[PDB]
């Protein structure tokens, strides 16, 4: 998918059809840090285990 933003929030959607989704840990994969990538933006990625770990 591709990250999109309606100007306020951030979503991940399939590249061929606007179906915005919450940016969870499963929707994405991690490789590296904030240095190398040009154009990176700041936001929060939801972790599905937070309600389970807390409860």
């Amino acid at each position: 998918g591709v990250f999109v933003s309606n100007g306020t929030h951030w979503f991940v959607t399939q590249r061929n059809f606007y179906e915005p989704q919450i940016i969870t840990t499963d929707n994405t994969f991690v490789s590296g840090n904030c240095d190398v990538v040009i154009g990176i933006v700041n936001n929060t990625v939801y972790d599905p285990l937070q309600p389970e770990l807390d409860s």
């Binding site: 591709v2 590249r15 490789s31 590296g32 190398v36 990538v37 040009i38 154009g39």
Partner: protein, 49 residues
């Protein structure tokens, strides 16, 4: 964006997106250098066309 579109092209040959983003500066130079050799290759030898 053209930086992002090439990540689609890279992702279509079995290479993940982050390979392009982490090496975008190297890749842009490789693309630019290879294009420049095209003019020389046609300009040097006239049997190309």
């Amino acid at each position: 964006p053209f930086p992002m579109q090439m990540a689609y092209r890279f992702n279509g040959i079995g290479v993940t997106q982050n390979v392009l983003y982490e090496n975008q500066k190297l890749i842009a130079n490789q693309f630019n250098s290879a294009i420049g050799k095209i003019q020389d290759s046609l300009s040097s030898t006239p049997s190309a066309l």
